[PDB]
Symmetry: D2
Subunit: 463 residues, 4 copies
């Protein structure tokens, strides 16, 4: 087992889905290395502020951040039924021992690690989402002027373009990118707060010096790479934070489910397919994204409920739930972005299928323009409307009652009434003349909104 024995349950998010990078962020090695990192930082800062901590103690700790004895820690945890003290012991064993965790409570490691993990998990998602957006934007640009049947109520509607529709998709994902970046940036550090949030043990440690306590809190926050620490906590950071993070993943799920549902419907229509020659192909990656996106939406109710029933300075009914929902929300989001990147790399378009479908539907939407051209030729709008209405009903009935191709244009051609227009008919039915401002909209959107958001991710010159 690197994901373990097949003789016991193994989470598919670990064993089947998420990237090894995100799997590692939520691994026990990452967690426990981070606990040691935090104890190292507490030591460093406690020394600076005058506590009795030698340079030598700080070096032996720094030298053993990664040398974690998991068999030992498991045995100690089993005996003490307390994970942090088990790790204090184990870290002391290879180390500095008497001053590890000096003055701190358990959440100094547990809760601050959770915050580092959440932020690092966001930092993994962000470039992946930007890559998907960038890949879709290339597609939108390429296909900006390609007419395609519009759909409202999934019924034929005013033509759009393949690239304009792709912009609906991109825009939602751009809102996600802004949301994730905001949440990542605004995440605050718990810091040093004590059992109930009052910093009592640290205040005793610093012999009543409130300013040394405030300095320590700022120092560990800065070492952890956070710009801001909470002033106010109970035992832990407010679980409202977990709602904020999972809500943004839930809304990302909704965007992806919509996008991948559209692609599935386009695949049925044979207009677009997932990246690669068999005649029948199933949109399995999009089906998978929808399946996983749904679980992201579902999971938002976990942190909403948890926060709602936290009592006072903390109840421990948050712990098991968070171990599952935070890790699994991010493993799920990771998988979805990885798959969606793959989807976005070489979407297959069939312009001749799209054209055929337009040829079958457009004439029903062209009748106003035909009416205008007759009236421009000095015809009667009224008479023309009545006549064209009857031809259209007849064409529609051939389609449904006979299962034939649409013959409206043929009907108009052999009708002498429309003789003043027969020479304009090809021009009047040119699909590019029905797509409104779709291509211009693509260009403006990409220039004004999409590329500026992508500029921090970019990662040839005139000479």
């Amino acid at each position: 087992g690197d994901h373990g024995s097949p003789d016991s349950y193994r989470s598919p998010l670990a064993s089947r889905y998420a990237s090894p990078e995100m799997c590692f962020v939520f691994s026990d090695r990452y967690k426990f290395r981070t606990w040691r990192q935090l104890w190292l930082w507490l030591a460093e800062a406690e020394q600076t502020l005058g506590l009795p901590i030698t340079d030598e103690q700080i070096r032996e700790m720094k030298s053993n951040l990664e040398n974690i004895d998991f068999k030992m820690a498991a045995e100690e945890e089993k005996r003490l039924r307390h994970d942090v003290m088990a790790h204090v012991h184990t870290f002391g064993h290879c180390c500095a021992a008497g001053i590890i965790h000096l003055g701190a409570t358990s959440c100094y490691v547990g809760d601050n690690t959770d915050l580092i993990i959440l932020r690092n998990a966001l930092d993994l998602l962000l470039p992946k989402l930007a890559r998907v957006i960038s890949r879709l934007a290339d597609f939108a640009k390429e296909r900006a002027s390609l007419p395609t049947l519009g759909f409202t109520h999934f019924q034929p509607a005013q033509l759009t373009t393949v690239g304009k529709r792709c912009c609906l998709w991109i825009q939602d994902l751009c809102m996600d990118l802004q949301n994730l970046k905001r949440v990542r940036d605004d995440l605050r550090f718990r810091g040093v707060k004590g059992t109930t949030g009052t910093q009592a043990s640290f205040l005793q440690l610093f012999e009543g010096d409130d300013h040394k306590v405030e300095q320590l809190d700022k120092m560990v926050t800065e070492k952890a790479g956070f710009k801001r620490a909470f002033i106010i906590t109970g035992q832990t950071y407010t679980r409202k934070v977990d709602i904020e993070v999972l809500s943004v993943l839930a809304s990302l799920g909704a965007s992806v489910h919509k996008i991948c549902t559209d692609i599935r419907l386009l695949a049925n229509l044979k207009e677009m397919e997932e990246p690669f020659m068999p005649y029948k192909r199933n949109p399995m990656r999009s089906e998978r994204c929808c399946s996983l996106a749904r679980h992201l939406m579902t999971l938002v109710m976990d942190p909403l409920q948890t926060a709602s029933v936290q009592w006072f300075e903390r109840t421990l009914d948050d712990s098991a739930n968070r171990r599952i929902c935070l890790a699994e929300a991010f493993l799920t989001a990771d998988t979805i972005l990885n798959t969606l990147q793959n989807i976005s790399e070489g979407l297959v378009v069939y312009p001749k299928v799209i054209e055929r479908r337009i040829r079958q539907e457009l004439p029903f939407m062209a009748t106003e323009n035909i009416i205008m051209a007759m009236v421009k030729a000095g015809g009667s709008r009224q008479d023309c409307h009545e006549k064209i209405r009857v031809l259209s009903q007849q064409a529609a009935s051939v389609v449904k009652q006979e299962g034939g191709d649409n013959d409206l244009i043929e009907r108009i051609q052999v009708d002498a009434y429309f003789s003043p227009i027969h020479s304009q008919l090809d021009h009047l039915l040119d699909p590019s003349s029905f797509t409104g401002r779709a291509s211009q909209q693509v260009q403006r959107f990409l220039e004004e909104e999409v590329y500026p958001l992508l500029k921090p991710y970019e990662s040839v010159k005139a000479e």
Copy 2:
């Protein structure tokens, strides 16, 4: 290793929480051995109904149900991008004589769906006795404490006395509703059987040269081999994903029951009236609420999934079900194992309970005091007013001074209540305020609980 390297995420449900039995039911070994079992049962039934399958082919399959080369299946899935096809191939590799007849006529869901149904039913069967055992233990506690008065709480404020056992029956009753729900869903679970790519059995009909009777026989025979009483007549490719709603909905409701019970226990621990088996934290109860919450959340997965299945099925159910079905059962198992341990060891502190009743009961006793004063030949009008002023004073000592409730002491030295003084002991006997609590416990256990547990 067994649970994997510490360099990946490892589910807490596997490594921390659930029993080995439930973890085994949701293991890849059990899943794939069951795929092979289903292929064996298909071959046996098909041979019986006249298809060209040999005893040697059958013996080969039977001999290799557990002999699963997980490495080969992983490689072949990477190549084929199809999990069932990968396992058909892998099973044909260790069963070369049988290779050509494995999966004959079937679509992938034949093994996938039917195995999930077998797993769901077996998971229900592990839960049901554990739930019965929790109910039995709480029933014993309820009988033992049926007559033990305790302060009633409405709005979490002092109310008409109950008994420790009577309150316990609130917990038990919800859990009995859960036992009944789980049993009904278990007994009512139908097998998908043999249905074909779109549910029409077209492949099987062709194999049997248009003999509809043989197709129906095949469906009956695999169903019976699988230990199910009934198969669907109607399916698309999959069994209706409405089934997953039915199963996870009863688990969600069980989560709500547990969350409430364990909330009350956590409050009782604050009150120092009851504890789980000087600072002592109700951590098992906290863990149960925490996991019960997840059980409730998960119900939204199958509701959504079934709502957007298109036609004879879409594959957007598959990843989701891999996550939620196992998680729901592992979560439920864990709660019931933990609740078993809580139920085994509940400690009651009667002296604390009695102290609290003595602090609160005098304020609820004023009516009784009036009636005795009245029957002694006193003014219902005047006795109310006299007692009300003493009560206002006593209430101020409690809230304004943080003092003990001295309402009875007040009445004892007030001569207007002379007719009543001899009776005060008896007028404030907490046993006389519990209404029918203890009788309710006895009737409930005899009429409702014991009969439900008799089968376990």
Copy 3:
């Protein structure tokens, strides 16, 4: 006015969606009438058990509800049940003293909610049965009409229009069984006192437990319920609300799936909702919209039950006013709308036929190979030859936007001369539907009609 002024928010469920019958079940008039009806049943039973009571000015004033007075009382007391005892007592001067004799507020509040829930289920059941019956008529009508099967919303082994309708019918039949079980299993709260201990009643009957049990039996029987709880706190267990809204949520999932399928078939022009060029399946869209809210709402009672403390907390009350009515008014609307969709549902066989003509040839190549082998050809060779023609046809379709000409390519090819005479029969769509039509028949005879018989 009847739905109020347009200058405030008015629920669309009342003003736009639900039937007047369902609206009236969740009306204040129905609610407060039932309060008085309960008060009459309480006084009647109390008299039969010998309390001091002679009932007719109560039975007189069941409908004579002075809403103006009651609102003034409630402002004054900030307690709805208190307000209506005073009001009913105002118009009932002869009985004011004996109204609510012994009871806590939940005697009217909670039992009325159970009466309302059961009456609401009783409005839904016939509606659901009727929809099922209409869909069954349609399934039988179209049992043999071949239609393109769909998995992943890609072409798959043919089904029939009627067989696909059976997928929809089955999910609804499960809903009908669920709704009937919950209706039949609903227990009355009866007479239970403030914390569930019947202390006030025990007192009233001077310690006679038997009479308290009898009273409880009597009011339950008067309310038309078979069974009361033995065990309650102040209220019936809010687990009941989970059981009810969960079955509604599952109904929403069924309906959302069915109406999604209809919307897809509407895009394909194979089906249309009953009678401009553009035809939109707006009733099916509305059903999906509302079904979605029905699934959403299950999280309300789940959360509520999970955080009820001890013998009850009042944080259930506002929530239940919203979610219970809304769930039933939503479900009423969906059933009404779905009935309307079923009535005149339009099928276009020639559209269905044309699409099968475009897709079936790609699924027919195995049968053509078999016919050629039978004519003494190589399986392998024939496969290669038909593969090249199939790729040509697929390119016409996807690369050129043409009609599928595979059958024509085979017809004009001399290699396939041994089966040219058989092609028309080899491509007969009815020969590709497997057991679809027989399954419709078996399902309707064994499962649907027996289920509907009781609703005849």
Copy 4:
């Protein structure tokens, strides 16, 4: 009547809970007045950009924005089975000159969607001041009570003392995050504008005879008339239903905050340490807040599911759901904030009840400082001797239902002779509250007051 007759279901959110102002924002009068406002603005802008619309047509529409014939609209809707077309016809009745130009070029969503956006923003602007007031009132209380020791609770068991004001800061902090969220969502809300049937503006482009600049300017002009800084460039028929998730998710999070705060107050009410403003009193307002906050949380699943299954340029399966969830979420949030303002206005505290509970629990928390004070004694010996006294004190409390007599046991014991002199001082409750008071002062100065300064009036 005003909320309708008692013979039908009447939403309790209208009839029983929400403020009349929020009820008005989600009323039909407001909705259909706003549809008319949007039609007028469209006509003004189109006229300016050169379409054949006259001043008297504009004046006619302007004169009739409130003159809504609801009976006629209902009859038209029963006839047309379409709400926007019914209202176009009905407006055209009271505006006969303008009738032919009402809705020119627009699709139905031009009024429906833009009105919803105006409504969401106006609803957000009604909540924000209410939330600010709650925060202010709690901040006042937190400052007053900043140094009042009270038992800390983890796992709802005795823990290191906090203060009444510090604990209040937990509540205030969550609500400040809500205030920031609501403001953000409000400020970032974009207008749908003029987009056409599938969002391509084809109809407008043709009206302007192919002049893209005119189409772009029309969209800008209506957006500016509606008081929005920014319009979408990209839409289908509708604004993206992701917007509805963004708004209801912030409301759901506020529900979570409120549920937690009011759960704490209900627990304090049990302990008799704090009560809601004016012997047995029930925290019924806090209970109702929890009840409604729960519904606000539940509602988040509606928009999530809706957005997830919107096909292409839109499907109509959003419409009925949005009629219910958007109004209800806001009417629920309104009610909660109205009630919470009342709860926050005069919280009752009982210091002597608080003090007694601290006296019962603090000895068990003070044992470390006793050992420190003894340690010129022995850390090992003092710890073993103090342990047995704590076992004796704990069994009195639990097994015998008595008062905590640990301090007495120490006082009588000759061993602790050298510490008896300082025992009162060692058990001073203010010495156990850590930095609670200072944390409150810094929080209020740094984080809360600056957030509230924009709401001074």
